[PDB]
Every structure is written in structure tokens, then in C-alpha cells.
Design a protein around this nucleic acid. Structure first.
Lengths: 190, 194, 114, 208, 181, 217
RNA sequence: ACCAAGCGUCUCUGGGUCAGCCCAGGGCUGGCCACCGAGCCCCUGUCUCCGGACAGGGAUGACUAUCGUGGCAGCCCCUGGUGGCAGCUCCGCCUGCCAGGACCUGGAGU
RNA sequence: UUGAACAAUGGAUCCUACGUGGACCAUGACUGGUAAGCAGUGCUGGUGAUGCGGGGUGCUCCGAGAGCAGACUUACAGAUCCCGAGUGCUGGCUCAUACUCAGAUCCCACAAAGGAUGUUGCUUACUAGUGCGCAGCUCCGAAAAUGGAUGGUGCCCAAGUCAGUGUGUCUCCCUUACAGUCUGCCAUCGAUGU
RNA sequence: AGCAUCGAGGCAGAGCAGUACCCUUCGGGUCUGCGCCAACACCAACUGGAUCUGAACUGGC
RNA sequence: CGGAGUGAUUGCCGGCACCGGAUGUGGUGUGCAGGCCUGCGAGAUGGCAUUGAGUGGGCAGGCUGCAAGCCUCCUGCCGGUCGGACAAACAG
């Protein structure tokens, strides 16, 4: 079965403009600008409003995988809208039983550093993507807390996952030894 | 819209043909009349095309859809005297086995072929010889010369009122016949009408 | 110079009549230019065709030209079609050589019937 | 351009966005029919399946070696041009005189070198990836596969192709201006001698 | 569609009247078969195996190929069939939009071959019917049962005769044009 | 997409390309499914006879009618007449490409020669005039975007020169200037001398906008 | 005498055009009589610029005038040959000097 | 109605010289055996004794049977190229990250139980959703030793797979066997007139 | 064969023009217009099924 | 031969200037003007457009370099072939 038509729409807020051409979606906004070349697919991806604008992704004679990938493209564009309007901010909380994980953002913005993870003398260097700021929160607000804020949910969440996978536990029962840096919340910078 | 039946594309008097082979490849000529079945007398005028009074097989010419309206022109020609036989001693190589069909379809050919005349000593062709390679060569030269001069009479007798007719008809026909027909890379003979 | 004029169609000798593992060297297959359907071969059916190749010694040229040439000619006729994609079956005399395959062959518009 | 290539004449086929084996087969049949072909930009040729699938296919192909002496064994080329030449070889009867004649009419090249950049290149509709593969389907790139198995000259050809494209853009703009003023000349003559076109009932022997 | 290679016959037959049964019952089958040979074949394959009347003891009174009354209006034919698989028999109800009943039957046969690897002699057509657009239960039919269906031609490949199938096409194609050439 | 498209809808005018009624017009009177449509085209010259056509066989024309499914001939012919679809089609670009092709096909030998003689006449002028315009535009490009001699004029050692054979006519050429019609044509084409100077080696002009058309099908 | 081109006879053989018989398909009189209500159609408003959405209502959706179904008419067509919507079964018939017409175009032997 | 059909250059009566008397293959017709390219049988046909076209290759499969040539046409089976014949036409289905690349005409060159919320269809119970199921393809199950084999290449809206279609009609339904038809010649066995 | 034809990218895309703009990373997107069948006269046409072009006749006057 | 149209093309004498490394854009390269750009535009042809003489301004320049004459049209004279002549390789 091939549906003659399927469309998924994403309402665009005011103050944000979503340009799209050749399936290269560019999104402007107060927090900045994003681009995404969703050219690995062959769908319509237009913006079709004057008063209240919407990004509509359409597929003509597609299959259920197309009716699903339309929604995932629309969701990516909605996350770009969020990243340019309110921004993304992932808060990672440190967890350690005996050895204080000492985290240090390097000279530039990049390169989070993890030392004394589980007593190990290794040092975990995680050089963050450009487009995402990592800042260590002061212990008054919340001790043992890093926050990664940006305009690209992909970049921010992948930096969070990179810090996570840098602080992993090997050769031990991971039901015990629960140490690591864990994403405590996926918030917005608003 | 009518497909109609199939017909034998054949040259008519006053039809522009295109010679497919020979000394004059692709030249456009005017079919005058049919001499034998399938052999026609043509001339793309010796002033227009440069093609003299000539014969052509219906098989080495393209029959275009250009008709000249050759009406009212003197097309009488001593075909036997102009075009020699070139095969002397017409039908003697072996003693005739008899022509032993008695009334129809041998006699009706033998009598019809005993009717026509023979190109006599001047208007006939000359078979070759040596005579010190020159006593034949010179005499052949003047024989050919006088035969060409005798043919020029009839050729101009046709071509002077034939050009005055095609110019009278419309003036571009003389350049139409002066131009030679060629095939180029984008011409597909199996699709070209004529 | 005199106007050199082209009154033939080019074709390629695409091998001999053959099954998968044996062949008939008497009937050559020819693919004609811009002819790509069987309907378009009814023109060339019956036409004469010549295969031109170059020797070393000088052989006599055209009939009556009395000048020799390095070209040599094998004349034939297009006898039938072959398949659906515009190939024809032609017969030559003498049979086309073996290094004739993948080579050009001229197909003249005579004997003409239109 | 070197002398032997200065002597070259034939068809130039843009191998970009072409399915490798379908390209090879069209090129092979035409070489057998006697054409000279140069398949240019063999790094941009496409293959019909996933990158990883074709990578493993090439791995298992290069697994094949003569165990007594490999230097005599099946040669596994790292150049996209040479991989393509071997696919075309396989499609041709290269172990006969006419087969090697066809294979030597084949003229594969990488990037777009000069005797072929000076020429109008074409594409085979059959064997073209866009006109052949369903958009649903996956595909890879021969230059990607060849750099995967080696072939240190991808970027070297990318730079040279960028330079060629800049020169081509200059020439394209000059050609645009010249075709502008050539239409100008045509109209100027259309004033003098009106163009007689095929769609005309006036062309006849009572006219003309 | 085009040339449904199937003809519809309404065959009527009985048994030769014996002296015990001087008026045997009369049966009328509806057969969608390539030709009348296969049609009468199927008729007798049902006569035997449902009535114990054999082609050699039976007698065809009518055959009557049926032509479509108005082939210029689209109908929605629901075909109820049964077919044999590697395992046993399965009942199927399918439906097709077509201008002719023989067209819908050829559509059904090629569809069954595609989806289930069924064959002509392994498919047995139980009743066929024509449905009002309010009675078609399948999605790929209900999507065309609207009045003004409308869609573009997007990844088109521009079918063209072999006479001018460019082997080298020195131009640049475009899958999204109207495709006149 | 931002391009405007043609849809397959009841009321379309389609170009039937294959079949006994090839190269004709038709109206989509119904859509069978996503592969087949039902088209009637007997309101057209030698058009189709109300059959079922394949979407691979059809081609979509730029226009469309306001009609319901399966419109009878009585109303469809008056709609195509009132909306003037035949002329609106013959005025298109594809119509003229197809008509030039079909006229080349059905052209006789006299017609082919007349076109060939016309182009052989017009080429004697087009070649010269294109060479003239190209020469003058490239000279303008040199005068604008080139490198002029820092040496002024009448202060450079002007070169050696031959003698006019002592017995030749003078025969001044008046064509040494661009005529005002030529100048207006160039000023209309508004050449980009930036581009004309950016590339040194001469190139061939490509084809022209309507090279493959026949005006007024 | 030989080689080649052409035109014919006869015996076969391949590929075509128009026909003829019998039917079919349509068109026009928006033919006439009776049914159909939807795959809908039309008029409003609002949201909107969406190759539109929804809520209303309307069979004056009348007078010719969207589409279909059952039957009964006259007149016109090249527009076709069961790849069609079919005659007194099935099957269109006829295969092309021996169920009968006019031709076209190749090939083999003679 | 000379009393069933069809066929039939045939019936009767003899004499006589040899070779053979290892067989083998195929099929629910089977028997012994776990089985075997095992052993032993039955009917028929083949191989032996037999070439030719196809199955890449193969004594046995499929077609067909063989004097020397010419023309036409086909069988089995085929058409991405190798390789003659459509990168035919019309609807589907399938995408397979491996070292068995998904798959790819009989024999035959393997695959099973079991499993999958991959996907396409259909039946069916419940009041659009949730259950059972059933078929098509796909995936796992799926391990051997020189490097290697749908025959190679490769193929992915296929060049895989399932159907339909190519009609004395077809825009493209064509290819060709030593087979069918016609012709010439050679030889054989005859008939007729001599 | 006339040994005539050299943009790039794309293919679910307006084309073209602009001495306009952003980096959204230097080829992508935005913006402004419809003159570019250069008067009018088309489709937002465009798959080379195209374009261009006649190898042109014997010497001298 | 000659006349008109067109001033384009080729070759050469100078000098000037400019390029080209994927296999120099080199097939041992390219261009070179009594001019060009922008305004006015006498007149003449069509109902304002076309064509078009000069002229203002600006920018350049072999301050007309030489030789030929290609091409389209018009028109010939003498002499020659016209014996490959009904096809025999694009008449070579």
C-alpha cells in the first residue's frame, strides 16, 4: 500500500524564520542560526504560511517508513526551532562513592577534563563540539554539576553522552560501583 | 488521413529524380521519358546540373515528389543513334539453337528486336585497337568528337526550351537542380520522404 | 576540388550469424546507424552494401577508372532483418573476413524502390 | 597532453552517478560495436548497495590470492579507474583478438584529464544511478571504497577537479556572452533574410 | 488497465439424458479463462468434483462469452476467491478498481501471483461482485474512492520507444519535468 | 518544492505519446488508480477514443479544465472549445519542438532543399555578423578590463609597415564600423565584459533559446 | 565464354498497404419514457494563502445544463476488428492464383 | 449393413554364418540396510552402440535423432555484457554488515526443527484499538581446512522472484539444433516402361 | 558519418538577472525583479528525439 | 572574367601585451582597431518601431600595415572533357 499523500506539519513561532530549499533547512532565531541538510531523503519539506507559518514535510506515494520519516524530519525541525528560541541545556550530575571526580574545563571552552574518576591515574579528556558551551556550576547551586548548553540538541546531547561514555566503569559489578557523570535533566535555557 | 493502398513509386516525365550512383552521384535531374522497362532518359540540364542527356536505371535514382510540368516540349530523340549498343555483333556468339517457339513470346520479341535500327559507323561506338597505339587513338578522338557534336544538337534542342520552362515556372528551380543531394549525420534514409 | 558527396548509410559488422557456440560465416549481422527498431529495416532490405578494407598491394580500382588503389571491396546485399533492435542479415561474396567484425560497412540506397 | 593521447578521438562518458556494472556493460557492448569510449571521473561512479556491503564485498574479493606466488595472482587494483577497467574486461572477451581490440578501445580515466576535458561528455541513461535506482534504495561511491582499501589520491583529484571547475566556469561565462551576441547576429540576419522553416505551405513549385 | 488477457464466459451444461434420468439438472458456471478451451475445462472440472458429471457423459448447451456492457465507467469489483498454498486452502477477499470485470480479474490474478505466489490453476474464483464506493473496505481503494484525487509525477523516468532511446544522451536529464521527450 | 508542478487530476489536458493515437491530446476524465487513468481525447484532431491510458504513456500539459468525472463528449468538446485548449497548447514550447520534429519528418525533398538553401544564404550573413559582433565585443573587453600601455599614444615607436604594391587601388572599407542596428542589438544583449575578458581562449557559441522550435505551429 | 547490374517466367519463402463480408464503437437531435443520489455539485461565513480547512444551508442541483442505470427513436462518421466491449454458439471471417479483388517489398532455386 | 474402428508391401515355408551371454542409468512399484555414486528386483525408455541444441563443464537429464548443400521455420531453452536474440511491455514482492555477498531453469551441486514487533497480503474473535492465526518474500538457525566461484562480471522500481503478453494483427517477440518444410545432388531399396 | 559541438550541481527542482545579504564555513541559504522566445507573440518550457553546417565542380581571359 | 553585397577570413612584416604543469588551457599557446562605450540622432520604410547620415562627450589605437578573396547574388568568352556516361571504393 502506497498512500497517495502524507503530510506532517510543524507550526513555526513568530520571530523565527525557517528557510528550506533543496531539503537544506536553515533556521534563524534570537538565539542564533542552525542548518541541517536532510538530503538523505526525497521528500518535499516546504514552508507554507504567511500569517501563521508551518513547515510541512510531504511524501507522495510513500510507505509507512516514509510516513514515519516525515514525522522524524518535522521533529528535527521542531528541535531546531527550540534550539533557536529557548536553547537546550543538559545538566549532568556527578556520582561517586569514594573518589571525588574532579572535572575541569580547559583553557578554551573545549576539552572537559575528568581526573580521579575512580582513583584511576588516567585522565579523561573530552573535547566538546564547537557550538556547545560546558560550564561547571558553583557548589552553592548544586555541587558536582556540569551543564552543557547550546542551540543544537544533537551537539549538546552528544557532548553529554561523550562525557558519560568517558566516565564508564570496567571490570566491576556495575550494580555496585555506581560512579559516573549522569544526565540529570534535559532542560531549556529559555 | 487516407492511408490508401501501396503503389509502385515510378519516375514520370518531368519528375525530379536524384541519381544514386555513377559519375553524377546525388545530382538532381529531370526524367524525360522511359526507354526500356525500368530505364529512363534523364537530364539535369548541362547548364543547370552539368548532367548530359543520360540514361538511368529506376534502381539507381530516387523518385522525389517534385514534378516539373514538362508539358509542351519537343522530347523526340533518336535513342538508338545517340546511345550506341557497345556490344557489337548483337546476338552472335553461338549458332542460334533455333528460336523454336513458333508464335508467341519468342517471335514477339525477335520481331520487335528486328524492328529497331543500328547506330551506323559514326554514331556507333568504336571498339579498341592498337595501330601503333596512335592510328587508332587519333581516329577514336575525332570519332568521339563528331559523335559528341551530333549529340549536342539534340541535347541543346531539349535544354534550351527546358530551361526557358523552369525559369518560366519559378526561378529557384535552377538552383534547386544545381544543388547536389548528400546525407549528413542527422539524416536517416529510412525516414526521409522524397 | 569536386564536391564529395555521401549517398550511403554506415553500419557496423556485429559478427556472423551464430548460436551461442557455433556460427554461420555466410550470413553477417550488421547494425545500421540510427536504426533501432525492426520496422526501420524495411528500407534497407535488399539494398547493396560494401565492406572496405585496405591491402598492401595496389589492386584495380573502379570499373573503367584504370587507376589502382590500396582499398579493396567486398560487395553484398541486405537479405533480411535480425531481431528487433535494427540489425540486418546481409550476404557477401566472398564471405566477409574475420577481422571485419567491429568495422564499418557502407549501405547504399540502391536498388531503390522507396 | 602526451602524443598518444593527442592522437585520441572518441566518445567521452561522464562516469559520475552511474551504476558501475550497468555502465561497464553498456560501454562493453559499444566497444564491441567498435566505438572508442573514455569513461571519465571513475571515482564518482556509484555501486548499487550499501557502503558497508560493498566494502565487505571488496574485502572478500581481495581475499583471493595465488598461494604459491601472489605477484602472479589476481591483481586487485586500488584505483577506481582500474577497478572499472577490470569490470569492463570481464564484460569483454578479452582473450581474443577482437576482444583485446575492444578492451584497448576502452579509455578509462580519473578526474577529468585534458584530452577529455576538451570534449563534450555524455551520460548513459541506462546505467545512470538517478534514472535507474529507486530513491528508496542505498548506494555507495567507488572513490570511497577505493580510499577504504587504499588509494591515497582522492583528495589530490578533488583539488584538481575544483581547479578544472573554476576554469570551466570562466569559459562558461564567456560562452554565455558569445551565445548572447550570436542570437543577436541571428536576429540581425532575420531582419535581412527571413528564416524559412519546415512548417510552411508556401514552399512549392507554384511559389518559391 | 490494458488487455486483461482474460475472457469471461457464462457456460451452461448438463448430462446426456439417460433413460433413468431423462432430464438431468442444468448447471451454469461463470468462468474467467484465457479462452473457451480453458473455460470449458474449468466448467467440467467443477461438473466432475461437484456433480459426478464427466466431460464424456456431459453436454454443453451454452458457452456465451460475456462482453462488458459499459467499459467507460470505473467500477470497484470485489472478488472472493480460494487458493491452494504449499499448506492447505485459504479464502481471500480482494477488490480492484477497473473498467471491466475481466480487467479486474486479470488484476486479481497478477496480484495474487505477486503477493502470494498463487497460480491460475490453483486459484478458484468464488463469487464476484461490484461495490458502491461506500462498500469498499480496503485502504488502497478508499484512497482513490474520492472524487478529485490529485497527485504529481515526481521521480518519473520518461518511458520512450527504442527507436530513440539515447545510448549516450549528451544532454542533462531531469526526473521532475513533464516528459514530452 | 518552490517550483510549480502539473498534477494528475480529473480535468487535466494530457499529451498521449504512445498507442495508435500517439502524439495527440486528451482530457483526464477519471483516474483508475496510481498507474492508470481514464482519458478521453476525441475533442481533438485525430485524438484518442476514450480509453484507459498509462501514466508512463501520458505527459502532462500546463493546463486544466473545470469538469466532473467522466464528462460526456457533448460537454467536453464545448469546454475545450470555450477554454481554447488547442491554441493554448500550440502556443507552448513543447508543441513547437514536436512540430519542428514532425515537419522535418514529413518534409519532402524540395522542402528540405528550400530550408537548406535558406540557411546557406543566411549563414553567409550570420557568420560574418557574428564574427563582427564577437570581434567588437572582445575589443571592448580589452579596452575596459585589460592592461593599457602606460606609454601614451604618439609616444611609442610605431612599427614597420609594408607598401601597397605601388599599383593597387585604395578601396576603403565602409564596414569597418558597427552599424547602429548592430550597436542597439549589443546594447540590448548587455554583454558582461568582465566575463568576456576573464577567459582568453576563444570558445564556440552554444545553441540558442528557441533553436528547435517552429513559430506558430 | 566469364564476372557484375537490371527486367521477367516458374517453384517456394519472409515482411506490408488498401480492401470485401459481418459486426462493433461513437456523434447529433443537450432525442424520448422511467429511475439514481453521490465519487458529489452549488451558494454563504470564518480560519486563512493553505494547488485549501471547517461549520451552515440548498434537489431553482428547477428551465437545456455533473455523473450513472433500464428501455425505446431518427439521422451522421474511418473510427475500429473481438488488444475488445460484438453477429444467427465458440471464433471476427478471409492469408493473398483454387471461398476468388488491387497492389507493395526482400530472399533461395530455376 | 460385405454386419466394429484404425493401420498394414504383406502372409506362409525353410535353410544358414556369426557376435553376445560382466551390464549400467532414470522413475511412490519396491525388498535388505541408518544410509550409500550400496546390494537386489519390476514396467518402460535410454546409455552401452549416440553424434547434434540447451543444462558453464558432465557416457544416462530436457529437445531431437545424424548423407552432401541452399533457403525458410522451429524444439528444448534463452536475450545486461561475455553470447545470437528486448537494459521488452504490464502489475506486484524482496534490500539481505560479509568471509555460503540475498537470490537466481529439472537432474544438480543441499538444508531442518525452531524463532523474528522486517515487510506484504488474508481470514478471524473482541468495541478504531487489541488477540489468534494463515500465506509471499526477507533475517537468524547456517561451522573446515590452497584463493574462488548463481559459469564470470556484476545485478537491487534487477540482470532476483511471482504472474500476465508478444495476436497470421504486435512502434520491440525475437534468437537458432545435424529437428520440421521446399529444392539440388550422392547412395540405397523399390515401382513403371523398356 | 561533416572526422563540427567542453559549465557546475541537482534530480521531491522554478529558470534567469542583480557591483543586494548571512555564514548557515566559501558553496549553501536569503533578498529584490520578470528584460533575458532582448518590441509584442509560450509553458514558471528544457532527456542530444538537439544544435550548427551544404566536402560545390574544367584551365585561362 | 568582371558588377554588387559584405569587411569577414586566411597568410605574412613589425612591435606590444597576455597567459598555460592533472597529460602546461602548448595539438610547441593567445590577442591586437581608419576603432569602441554612452547620448543626440538628419533622413528613408512600416503605424511610434525599424533602418540609417553625421555629430557631442568619454575610452582607446599598426596616427587605414601588407597580400590574397572566401562567402551570397548577377553575368559571361575561348578552349577542354563529355569513352568509367545505365552501377562497379565519397571519380580518388
Amino acid at each position: 500500500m502506497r498512500a497517495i499523500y502524507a503530510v506532517h506539519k510543524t507550526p513555526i513561532p513568530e520571530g523565527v524564520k525557517v528557510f528550506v530549499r533543496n531539503r537544506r533547512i536553515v533556521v534563524r532565531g534570537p538565539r542564533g542560526t542552525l542548518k541541517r541538510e536532510m538530503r538523505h531523503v526525497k521528500y518535499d519539506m516546504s514552508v507554507k504560511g504567511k500569517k501563521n507559518k508551518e513547515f510541512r514535510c510531504e511524501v507522495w506515494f510513500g510507505k509507512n517508513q516514509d510516513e514515519a520519516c516525515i514525522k522524524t524530519i518535522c521533529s528535527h525541525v521542531a528541535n531546531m526551532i527550540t534550539g533557536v528560541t529557548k536553547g537546550f541545556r543538559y545538566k549532568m550530575r556527578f556520582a561517586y562513592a569514594h573518589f571525588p571526580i574532579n572535572v575541569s574545563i580547559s583553557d578554551d571552552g573545549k576539552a572537559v577534563e575528568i581526573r580521579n574518576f575512580l582513583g584511576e591515574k588516567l585522565i579523561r579528556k573530552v573535547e566538546v563540539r564547537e557550538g556547545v558551551s560546558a560550564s561547571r556550576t558553583d557548589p552553592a547551586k548544586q555541587k558536582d554539576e556540569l551543564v552543557l548548553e547550546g542551540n543544537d540538541i544533537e551537539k549538546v546531547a552528544q557532548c553529554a553522552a561523550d562525557i558519560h561514555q568517558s566516565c564508564l566503569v570496567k571490570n566491576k559489578d556495575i550494580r555496585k560501583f555506581l560512579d559516573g557523570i549522569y544526565v540529570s535533566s534535559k532542560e531549556t535555557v529559555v | 488521413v487516407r492511408k490508401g493502398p501501396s503503389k509502385k513509386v515510378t519516375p514520370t516525365p518531368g519528375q525530379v529524380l536524384i541519381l544514386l550512383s555513377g559519375r553524377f552521384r546525388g545530382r538532381r535531374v529531370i526524367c524525360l521519358k522511359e526507354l526500356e522497362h525500368g530505364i529512363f532518359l534523364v537530364t539535369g540540364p548541362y547548364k543547370v546540373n552539368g548532367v548530359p542527356l543520360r540514361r538511368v536505371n529506376r534502381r539507381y535514382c530516387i523518385c522525389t515528389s517534385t514534378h516539373i510540368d514538362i508539358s509542351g516540349l519537343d522530347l523526340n530523340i533518336p535513342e538508338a543513334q545517340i546511345f550506341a549498343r557497345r556490344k557489337a555483333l548483337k546476338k552472335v556468339k553461338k549458332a542460334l539453337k533455333g528460336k523454336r517457339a513458333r508464335a508467341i513470346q519468342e517471335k514477339k520479341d525477335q520481331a520487335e528486336v528486328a524492328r529497331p535500327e543500328n547506330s551506323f559507323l559514326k554514331r556507333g561506338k568504336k571498339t579498341k585497337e592498337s595501330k601503333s597505339e596512335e592510328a587508332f587513338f587519333e581516329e577514336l578522338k575525332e570519332h568521339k568528337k563528331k559523335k559528341a557534336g551530333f549529340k549536342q544538337q539534340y541535347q541543346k534542342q531539349i535544354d534550351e526550351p527546358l530551361i526557358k520552362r523552369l525559369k518560366e515556372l519559378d526561378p529557384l528551380l535552377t538552383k534547386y537542380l544545381s544543388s547536389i543531394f548528400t546525407l549528413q549525420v542527422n539524416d536517416k534514409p529510412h525516414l526521409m520522404r522524397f | 576540388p569536386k564536391p564529395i558527396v555521401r549517398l550511403f548509410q554506415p553500419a557496423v559488422m556485429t559478427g556472423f550469424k551464430r548460436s551461442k557456440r557455433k556460427q554461420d560465416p555466410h550470413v553477417a549481422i550488421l547494425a545500421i546507424k540510427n536504426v533501432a527498431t525492426r520496422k526501420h529495416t524495411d528500407f534497407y532490405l535488399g539494398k547493396r552494401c560494401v565492406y572496405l578494407y585496405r591491402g598492401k598491394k595496389k589492386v584495380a580500382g573502379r570499373k573503367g577508372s584504370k587507376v589502382k588503389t590500396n582499398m579493396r571491396r567486398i560487395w553484398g546485399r541486405i537479405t533480411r532483418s535480425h531481431g528487433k533492435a535494427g540489425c540486418v542479415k546481409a550476404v557477401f561474396k566472398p564471405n566477409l573476413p574475420g577481422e571485419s567484425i567491429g568495422r564499418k560497412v557502407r549501405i547504399y540506397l540502391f536498388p531503390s524502390s522507396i | 597532453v602526451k602524443p598518444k593521447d593527442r592522437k585520441w578521438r572518441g566518445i567521452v562518458v561522464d562516469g559520475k552517478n552511474h551504476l558501475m556494472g550497468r555502465l561497464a556493460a553498456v560501454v562493453a557492448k559499444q566497444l564491441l560495436r567498435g566505438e572508442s569510449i573514455c569513461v571519465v571521473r571513475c571515482e564518482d561512479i556509484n555501486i548499487s548497495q550499501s557502503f558497508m556491503r560493498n566494502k565487505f564485498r571488496l574485502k572478500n574479493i581481495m581475499r583471493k590470492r595465488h598461494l604459491t606466488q601472489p605477484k602472479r595472482g589476481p591483481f586487485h587494483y586500488r584505483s577506481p579507474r582500474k577497478m572499472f577497467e577490470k569490470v569492463v574486461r570481464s564484460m569483454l572477451p578479452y582473450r581474443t583478438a577482437h576482444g583485446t581490440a575492444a578492451f584497448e578501445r576502452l579509455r578509462v580515466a580519473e578526474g577529468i584529464p585534458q584530452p577529455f576535458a576538451k570534449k563534450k561528455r555524455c551520460i548513459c541513461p541506462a546505467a545512470h544511478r538517478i534514472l535507474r535506482l529507486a530513491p528508496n534504495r542505498k548506494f555507495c561511491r567507488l572513490g570511497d571504497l577505493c580510499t577504504d582499501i587504499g588509494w591515497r589520491h582522492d583528495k589530490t583529484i578533488k583539488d584538481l577537479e575544483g581547479k578544472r571547475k573554476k576554469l570551466a566556469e570562466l569559459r562558461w561565462k564567456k560562452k554565455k556572452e558569445l551565445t548572447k551576441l550570436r542570437r543577436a547576429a541571428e536576429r540581425l540576419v532575420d531582419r535581412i533574410i527571413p528564416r524559412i522553416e519546415y512548417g510552411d505551405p508556401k514552399i512549392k513549385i507554384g511559389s518559391l | 488497465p490494458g488487455f486483461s488477457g482474460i475472457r469471461h464466459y457464462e457456460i451452461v451444461g448438463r448430462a446426456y439424458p439417460t433413460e433413468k434420468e431423462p432430464s438431468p439438472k442444468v448447471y451454469k458456471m461463470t468462468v474467467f479463462a484465457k479462452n473457451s478451451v480453458v473455460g470449458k475445462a474449468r466448467f467440467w472440472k467443477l461438473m466432475r468434483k461437484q456433480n459426478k458429471v464427466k466431460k464424456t457423459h456431459g453436454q454443453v448447451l451454452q458457452i456465451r462469452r460475456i462482453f462488458e456492457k459499459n467499459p467507460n465507467t470505473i467500477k470497484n469489483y470485489s472478488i472472493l476467491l480460494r487458493y491452494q498454498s504449499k499448506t492447505g486452502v485459504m479464502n481471500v477477499s480482494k477488490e480492484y478498481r477497473d473498467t471491466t470485470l475481466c480487467g479486474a480479474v486479470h488484476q486479481m490474478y497478477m496480484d495474487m501471483a505477486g503477493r502470494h505466489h498463487a497460480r491460475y490453476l490453483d486459484i478458484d474464483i468464488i463469487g464476484t461482485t461490484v461495490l458502491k464506493p461506500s462498500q469498499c473496505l480496503r485502504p488502497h481503494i478508499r484512497q482513490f474512492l474520492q472524487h478529485k484525487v490529485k497527485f504529481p509525477l515526481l521521480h518519473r523516468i520518461t518511458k520512450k520507444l527504442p527507436q530513440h532511446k539515447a545510448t549516450f544522451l549528451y544532454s542533462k536529464p531531469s526526473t521532475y519535468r513533464s516528459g514530452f521527450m | 518544492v518552490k517550483a510549480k508542478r502539473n498534477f494528475v487530476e480529473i480535468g487535466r489536458v494530457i499529451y498521449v505519446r504512445f498507442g495508435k493515437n500517439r502524439d495527440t491530446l486528451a482530457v483526464i476524465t477519471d483516474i483508475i488508480d496510481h498507474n492508470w487513468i481514464f482519458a478521453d481525447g476525441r475533442a481533438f484532431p485525430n485524438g484518442m477514443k476514450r480509453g484507459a491510458v498509462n501514466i508512463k504513456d501520458i505527459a502532462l500539459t500546463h493546463m486544466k479544465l473545470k469538469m466532473g468525472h467522466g464528462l460526456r463528449h457533448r460537454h467536453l468538446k464545448e469546454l475545450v472549445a470555450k477554454e481554447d485548449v488547442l491554441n493554448k497548447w500550440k502556443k507552448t514550447t513543447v508543441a513547437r519542438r514536436l512540430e519542428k520534429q514532425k515537419n522535418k519528418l514529413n518534409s519532402t525533398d524540395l522542402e528540405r532543399w528550400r530550408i537548406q538553401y535558406n540557411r546557406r544564404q543566411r549563414s553567409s550573413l550570420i557568420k560574418v555578423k557574428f564574427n563582427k559582433l564577437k570581434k567588437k565585443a572582445l575589443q571592448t573587453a580589452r579596452r575596459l578590463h585589460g592592461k593599457k600601455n602606460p606609454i601614451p599614444f604618439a609616444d611609442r615607436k610605431k612599427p614597420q609597415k609594408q607598401a601597397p604594391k605601388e599599383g593597387k587601388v585604395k578601396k576603403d572599407d565602409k564596414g569597418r564600423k558597427l552599424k547602429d542596428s548592430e550597436r542597439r542589438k549589443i546594447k540590448k544583449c548587455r554583454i558582461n565584459y568582465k566575463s568576456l575578458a576573464g577567459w582568453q581562449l576563444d570558445v564556440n557559441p552554444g545553441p540558442i533559446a528557441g533553436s528547435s522550435l517552429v513559430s506558430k505551429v
